PDB file of C-alpha atoms in Angstrom:
ATOM      1  CA  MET A  11       0.000   0.000   0.000  1.00  0.00           C
ATOM      2  CA  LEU A  12       0.880   3.635  -0.870  1.00  0.00           C
ATOM      3  CA  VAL A  13       0.092   6.342   1.739  1.00  0.00           C
ATOM      4  CA  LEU A  14      -0.032  10.065   0.971  1.00  0.00           C
ATOM      5  CA  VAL A  15       0.982  12.338   3.900  1.00  0.00           C
ATOM      6  CA  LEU A  16       0.478  16.086   3.672  1.00  0.00           C
ATOM      7  CA  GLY A  17      -1.012  19.119   5.282  1.00  0.00           C
ATOM      8  CA  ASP A  18      -0.647  22.737   6.297  1.00  0.00           C
ATOM      9  CA  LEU A  19      -1.839  23.738   2.830  1.00  0.00           C
ATOM     10  CA  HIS A  20      -3.786  26.811   4.092  1.00  0.00           C
ATOM     11  CA  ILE A  21      -5.929  27.021   0.964  1.00  0.00           C
ATOM     12  CA  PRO A  22      -7.222  29.501   0.078  1.00  0.00           C
ATOM     13  CA  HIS A  23      -6.127  32.207   2.634  1.00  0.00           C
ATOM     14  CA  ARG A  24      -2.391  31.796   2.186  1.00  0.00           C
ATOM     15  CA  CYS A  25      -2.064  29.791  -0.975  1.00  0.00           C
ATOM     16  CA  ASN A  26      -4.433  29.430  -3.826  1.00  0.00           C
ATOM     17  CA  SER A  27      -3.404  25.929  -4.801  1.00  0.00           C
ATOM     18  CA  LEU A  28      -1.211  22.957  -4.375  1.00  0.00           C
ATOM     19  CA  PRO A  29       1.865  23.669  -6.507  1.00  0.00           C
ATOM     20  CA  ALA A  30       1.331  22.137  -9.970  1.00  0.00           C
ATOM     21  CA  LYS A  31       4.604  20.313  -9.623  1.00  0.00           C
ATOM     22  CA  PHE A  32       3.248  18.365  -6.633  1.00  0.00           C
ATOM     23  CA  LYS A  33      -0.297  18.117  -7.864  1.00  0.00           C
ATOM     24  CA  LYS A  34       0.910  16.539 -11.168  1.00  0.00           C
ATOM     25  CA  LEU A  35       2.294  13.617  -9.146  1.00  0.00           C
ATOM     26  CA  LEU A  36      -1.056  12.658  -7.588  1.00  0.00           C
ATOM     27  CA  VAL A  37      -3.744  10.789  -9.486  1.00  0.00           C
ATOM     28  CA  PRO A  38      -6.794   8.720  -8.648  1.00  0.00           C
ATOM     29  CA  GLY A  39      -6.118   4.959  -8.584  1.00  0.00           C
ATOM     30  CA  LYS A  40      -2.605   4.826  -7.066  1.00  0.00           C
ATOM     31  CA  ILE A  41      -2.925   5.767  -3.333  1.00  0.00           C
ATOM     32  CA  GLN A  42      -4.740   3.528  -0.819  1.00  0.00           C
ATOM     33  CA  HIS A  43      -4.557   5.806   2.312  1.00  0.00           C
ATOM     34  CA  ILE A  44      -4.179   9.517   2.944  1.00  0.00           C
ATOM     35  CA  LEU A  45      -2.901  10.841   6.269  1.00  0.00           C
ATOM     36  CA  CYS A  46      -3.480  14.554   6.414  1.00  0.00           C
ATOM     37  CA  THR A  47      -2.294  16.642   9.332  1.00  0.00           C
ATOM     38  CA  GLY A  48      -4.976  19.313   8.719  1.00  0.00           C
ATOM     39  CA  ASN A  49      -5.126  23.037   7.887  1.00  0.00           C
ATOM     40  CA  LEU A  50      -6.417  22.196   4.420  1.00  0.00           C
ATOM     41  CA  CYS A  51      -8.517  24.697   5.431  1.00  0.00           C
ATOM     42  CA  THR A  52     -11.695  24.069   3.439  1.00  0.00           C
ATOM     43  CA  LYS A  53     -14.070  21.519   1.867  1.00  0.00           C
ATOM     44  CA  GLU A  54     -12.769  22.062  -1.690  1.00  0.00           C
ATOM     45  CA  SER A  55      -9.378  20.592  -0.713  1.00  0.00           C
ATOM     46  CA  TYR A  56     -10.970  17.782   1.315  1.00  0.00           C
ATOM     47  CA  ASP A  57     -13.086  16.683  -1.681  1.00  0.00           C
ATOM     48  CA  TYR A  58      -9.950  16.687  -3.844  1.00  0.00           C
ATOM     49  CA  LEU A  59      -8.237  14.335  -1.374  1.00  0.00           C
ATOM     50  CA  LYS A  60     -11.282  12.047  -1.544  1.00  0.00           C
ATOM     51  CA  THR A  61     -10.850  11.678  -5.348  1.00  0.00           C
ATOM     52  CA  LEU A  62      -7.388  10.312  -4.681  1.00  0.00           C
ATOM     53  CA  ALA A  63      -8.156   7.558  -2.172  1.00  0.00           C
ATOM     54  CA  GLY A  64     -11.020   5.683  -0.500  1.00  0.00           C
ATOM     55  CA  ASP A  65      -9.368   5.839   2.998  1.00  0.00           C
ATOM     56  CA  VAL A  66      -8.857   9.502   4.016  1.00  0.00           C
ATOM     57  CA  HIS A  67      -7.758  10.264   7.614  1.00  0.00           C
ATOM     58  CA  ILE A  68      -7.622  13.903   8.586  1.00  0.00           C
ATOM     59  CA  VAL A  69      -6.969  15.598  11.919  1.00  0.00           C
ATOM     60  CA  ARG A  70      -8.127  19.017  12.927  1.00  0.00           C
ATOM     61  CA  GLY A  71      -5.791  21.954  12.360  1.00  0.00           C
ATOM     62  CA  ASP A  72      -6.228  25.369  14.081  1.00  0.00           C
ATOM     63  CA  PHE A  73      -7.402  27.144  10.882  1.00  0.00           C
ATOM     64  CA  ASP A  74      -9.692  24.392   9.471  1.00  0.00           C
ATOM     65  CA  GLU A  75     -13.347  25.376   8.846  1.00  0.00           C
ATOM     66  CA  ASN A  76     -14.519  21.834   9.550  1.00  0.00           C
ATOM     67  CA  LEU A  77     -14.693  21.023  13.338  1.00  0.00           C
ATOM     68  CA  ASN A  78     -15.969  17.525  12.819  1.00  0.00           C
ATOM     69  CA  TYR A  79     -12.303  16.489  12.111  1.00  0.00           C
ATOM     70  CA  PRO A  80     -11.061  14.626  15.214  1.00  0.00           C
ATOM     71  CA  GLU A  81      -8.226  16.211  17.271  1.00  0.00           C
ATOM     72  CA  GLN A  82      -6.083  13.088  16.973  1.00  0.00           C
ATOM     73  CA  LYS A  83      -6.225   9.556  15.605  1.00  0.00           C
ATOM     74  CA  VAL A  84      -4.477   6.242  15.933  1.00  0.00           C
ATOM     75  CA  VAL A  85      -4.788   4.403  12.647  1.00  0.00           C
ATOM     76  CA  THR A  86      -3.659   0.920  11.496  1.00  0.00           C
ATOM     77  CA  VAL A  87      -2.167   0.653   7.973  1.00  0.00           C
ATOM     78  CA  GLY A  88      -0.845  -2.844   7.265  1.00  0.00           C
ATOM     79  CA  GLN A  89       1.401  -3.958  10.132  1.00  0.00           C
ATOM     80  CA  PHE A  90       1.878  -0.383  11.453  1.00  0.00           C
ATOM     81  CA  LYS A  91       0.131   1.745  14.102  1.00  0.00           C
ATOM     82  CA  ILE A  92       0.269   5.403  13.113  1.00  0.00           C
ATOM     83  CA  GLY A  93      -0.336   8.303  15.432  1.00  0.00           C
ATOM     84  CA  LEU A  94      -1.649  11.461  13.795  1.00  0.00           C
ATOM     85  CA  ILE A  95      -2.172  14.930  15.289  1.00  0.00           C
ATOM     86  CA  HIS A  96      -1.784  18.373  13.738  1.00  0.00           C
ATOM     87  CA  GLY A  97       0.335  19.884  16.552  1.00  0.00           C
ATOM     88  CA  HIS A  98      -0.930  23.469  17.226  1.00  0.00           C
ATOM     89  CA  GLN A  99      -2.300  22.184  20.607  1.00  0.00           C
ATOM     90  CA  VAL A 100      -0.888  23.876  23.769  1.00  0.00           C
ATOM     91  CA  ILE A 101      -0.697  21.218  26.499  1.00  0.00           C
ATOM     92  CA  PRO A 102       1.625  21.507  29.533  1.00  0.00           C
ATOM     93  CA  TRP A 103       3.571  18.302  30.336  1.00  0.00           C
ATOM     94  CA  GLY A 104       2.523  18.540  34.096  1.00  0.00           C
ATOM     95  CA  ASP A 105      -1.204  17.972  33.582  1.00  0.00           C
ATOM     96  CA  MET A 106      -0.686  14.238  34.520  1.00  0.00           C
ATOM     97  CA  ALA A 107      -4.165  13.069  33.430  1.00  0.00           C
ATOM     98  CA  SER A 108      -3.549  14.528  29.920  1.00  0.00           C
ATOM     99  CA  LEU A 109      -0.146  12.862  29.924  1.00  0.00           C
ATOM    100  CA  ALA A 110      -1.605   9.422  30.740  1.00  0.00           C
ATOM    101  CA  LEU A 111      -3.946   9.929  27.708  1.00  0.00           C
ATOM    102  CA  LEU A 112      -0.997  10.866  25.529  1.00  0.00           C
ATOM    103  CA  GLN A 113       0.599   7.452  26.237  1.00  0.00           C
ATOM    104  CA  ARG A 114      -1.744   6.190  23.392  1.00  0.00           C
ATOM    105  CA  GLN A 115      -0.385   8.714  20.890  1.00  0.00           C
ATOM    106  CA  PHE A 116       3.288   8.054  21.659  1.00  0.00           C
ATOM    107  CA  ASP A 117       2.897   4.213  21.744  1.00  0.00           C
ATOM    108  CA  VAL A 118       2.793   3.988  18.007  1.00  0.00           C
ATOM    109  CA  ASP A 119       5.138   2.720  15.208  1.00  0.00           C
ATOM    110  CA  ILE A 120       4.961   5.904  13.154  1.00  0.00           C
ATOM    111  CA  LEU A 121       4.255   9.371  14.507  1.00  0.00           C
ATOM    112  CA  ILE A 122       3.037  12.049  12.128  1.00  0.00           C
ATOM    113  CA  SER A 123       2.333  15.702  12.859  1.00  0.00           C
ATOM    114  CA  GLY A 124       2.323  19.124  11.215  1.00  0.00           C
ATOM    115  CA  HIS A 125       2.122  22.670  12.551  1.00  0.00           C
ATOM    116  CA  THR A 126       5.815  23.697  12.315  1.00  0.00           C
ATOM    117  CA  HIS A 127       5.881  23.579   8.456  1.00  0.00           C
ATOM    118  CA  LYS A 128       9.395  22.011   8.585  1.00  0.00           C
ATOM    119  CA  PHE A 129       9.659  18.519   7.193  1.00  0.00           C
ATOM    120  CA  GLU A 130      11.264  15.730   9.173  1.00  0.00           C
ATOM    121  CA  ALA A 131      11.745  12.068   8.412  1.00  0.00           C
ATOM    122  CA  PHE A 132      13.777   9.807  10.745  1.00  0.00           C
ATOM    123  CA  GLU A 133      14.044   6.556  12.630  1.00  0.00           C
ATOM    124  CA  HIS A 134      14.426   6.559  16.404  1.00  0.00           C
ATOM    125  CA  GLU A 135      14.325   3.490  18.700  1.00  0.00           C
ATOM    126  CA  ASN A 136      12.357   1.258  16.347  1.00  0.00           C
ATOM    127  CA  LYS A 137       9.756   3.904  15.517  1.00  0.00           C
ATOM    128  CA  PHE A 138       9.569   6.330  12.552  1.00  0.00           C
ATOM    129  CA  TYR A 139       8.747  10.056  12.782  1.00  0.00           C
ATOM    130  CA  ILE A 140       7.287  12.202   9.952  1.00  0.00           C
ATOM    131  CA  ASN A 141       6.365  15.876   9.605  1.00  0.00           C
ATOM    132  CA  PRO A 142       5.438  16.312   5.939  1.00  0.00           C
ATOM    133  CA  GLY A 143       5.878  20.054   6.129  1.00  0.00           C
ATOM    134  CA  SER A 144       3.448  22.319   4.290  1.00  0.00           C
ATOM    135  CA  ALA A 145       2.483  21.052   0.845  1.00  0.00           C
ATOM    136  CA  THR A 146       2.067  24.661  -0.367  1.00  0.00           C
ATOM    137  CA  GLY A 147       5.041  26.205   1.455  1.00  0.00           C
ATOM    138  CA  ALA A 148       2.680  28.405   3.427  1.00  0.00           C
ATOM    139  CA  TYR A 149       4.201  30.764   6.054  1.00  0.00           C
ATOM    140  CA  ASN A 150       4.188  29.934   9.798  1.00  0.00           C
ATOM    141  CA  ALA A 151       4.137  32.237  12.882  1.00  0.00           C
ATOM    142  CA  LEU A 152       7.955  31.929  12.741  1.00  0.00           C
ATOM    143  CA  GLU A 153       9.013  32.005   9.035  1.00  0.00           C
ATOM    144  CA  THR A 154       8.179  33.270   5.494  1.00  0.00           C
ATOM    145  CA  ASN A 155      10.197  31.433   2.740  1.00  0.00           C
ATOM    146  CA  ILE A 156       9.152  27.911   3.612  1.00  0.00           C
ATOM    147  CA  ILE A 157       9.962  25.171   1.095  1.00  0.00           C
ATOM    148  CA  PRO A 158       6.872  23.239  -0.033  1.00  0.00           C
ATOM    149  CA  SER A 159       7.024  19.495   0.799  1.00  0.00           C
ATOM    150  CA  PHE A 160       4.905  16.333   1.091  1.00  0.00           C
ATOM    151  CA  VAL A 161       5.469  12.636   1.698  1.00  0.00           C
ATOM    152  CA  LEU A 162       4.580   9.212   0.218  1.00  0.00           C
ATOM    153  CA  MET A 163       5.069   6.088   2.270  1.00  0.00           C
ATOM    154  CA  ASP A 164       5.383   2.852   0.423  1.00  0.00           C
ATOM    155  CA  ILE A 165       4.465   0.197   2.937  1.00  0.00           C
ATOM    156  CA  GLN A 166       5.259  -3.494   2.340  1.00  0.00           C
ATOM    157  CA  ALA A 167       4.995  -6.005   5.225  1.00  0.00           C
ATOM    158  CA  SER A 168       7.346  -4.613   7.949  1.00  0.00           C
ATOM    159  CA  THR A 169       9.284  -2.221   5.596  1.00  0.00           C
ATOM    160  CA  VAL A 170       8.258   1.404   5.005  1.00  0.00           C
ATOM    161  CA  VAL A 171       9.994   3.416   2.279  1.00  0.00           C
ATOM    162  CA  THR A 172       9.345   7.143   2.922  1.00  0.00           C
ATOM    163  CA  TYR A 173       9.731   9.566   0.012  1.00  0.00           C
ATOM    164  CA  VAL A 174      10.069  13.280   0.893  1.00  0.00           C
ATOM    165  CA  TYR A 175       9.205  15.590  -2.022  1.00  0.00           C
ATOM    166  CA  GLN A 176      10.525  19.129  -1.922  1.00  0.00           C
ATOM    167  CA  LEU A 177      10.052  22.013  -4.358  1.00  0.00           C
ATOM    168  CA  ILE A 178      13.509  23.613  -4.506  1.00  0.00           C
ATOM    169  CA  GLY A 179      13.831  26.044  -7.395  1.00  0.00           C
ATOM    170  CA  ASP A 180      12.365  24.578 -10.564  1.00  0.00           C
ATOM    171  CA  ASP A 181      12.773  20.925  -9.705  1.00  0.00           C
ATOM    172  CA  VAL A 182      11.249  18.424  -7.377  1.00  0.00           C
ATOM    173  CA  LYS A 183      13.905  16.802  -5.207  1.00  0.00           C
ATOM    174  CA  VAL A 184      13.151  13.446  -3.584  1.00  0.00           C
ATOM    175  CA  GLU A 185      14.856  11.919  -0.547  1.00  0.00           C
ATOM    176  CA  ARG A 186      14.271   8.185   0.083  1.00  0.00           C
ATOM    177  CA  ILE A 187      14.492   6.676   3.595  1.00  0.00           C
ATOM    178  CA  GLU A 188      14.121   2.945   4.450  1.00  0.00           C
ATOM    179  CA  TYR A 189      12.720   1.758   7.782  1.00  0.00           C
ATOM    180  CA  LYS A 190      12.195  -1.854   8.835  1.00  0.00           C
ATOM    181  CA  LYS A 191      10.508  -2.422  12.156  1.00  0.00           C
ATOM    182  CA  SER A 192      12.579  -4.490  14.547  1.00  0.00           C
TER     183      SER A 192
END
């Protein structure tokens, strides 16, 4: 199975569109799951995602018009448990009851969140961590010249191959990272 991972698009307030160079790469009939970190911002973009795959999992960002999106999800895709949360949430570590609830979200094979608009892909202690960045390169509270990125995970048994797509200049650059659980 192929999994699309994206978010922080902020369409249409900050960006009018997915960049054509990313949007070219996506087509109905290839992707089995989408894991979206939120801030799409609007139903137009959600419907687009639904043309691409039959299993669409979205979490609620802080600028999303739709409040029916759940705050956080744990989702099974093949052999992997995947924790998904946007990340704009302000939660102090010392609220112990909240912390006990967060054990669920950390006790996952792959952790995905957004919010910072800086991509990350790495292995740490038998788990994998992804922030897909912002698929439109939208600005954050912090920064203005953010590089658009998104991710595809190619999942096969207990191997994930993560592909990070970045729009640097005129070209798409792709980094490929292999993870095997155990």
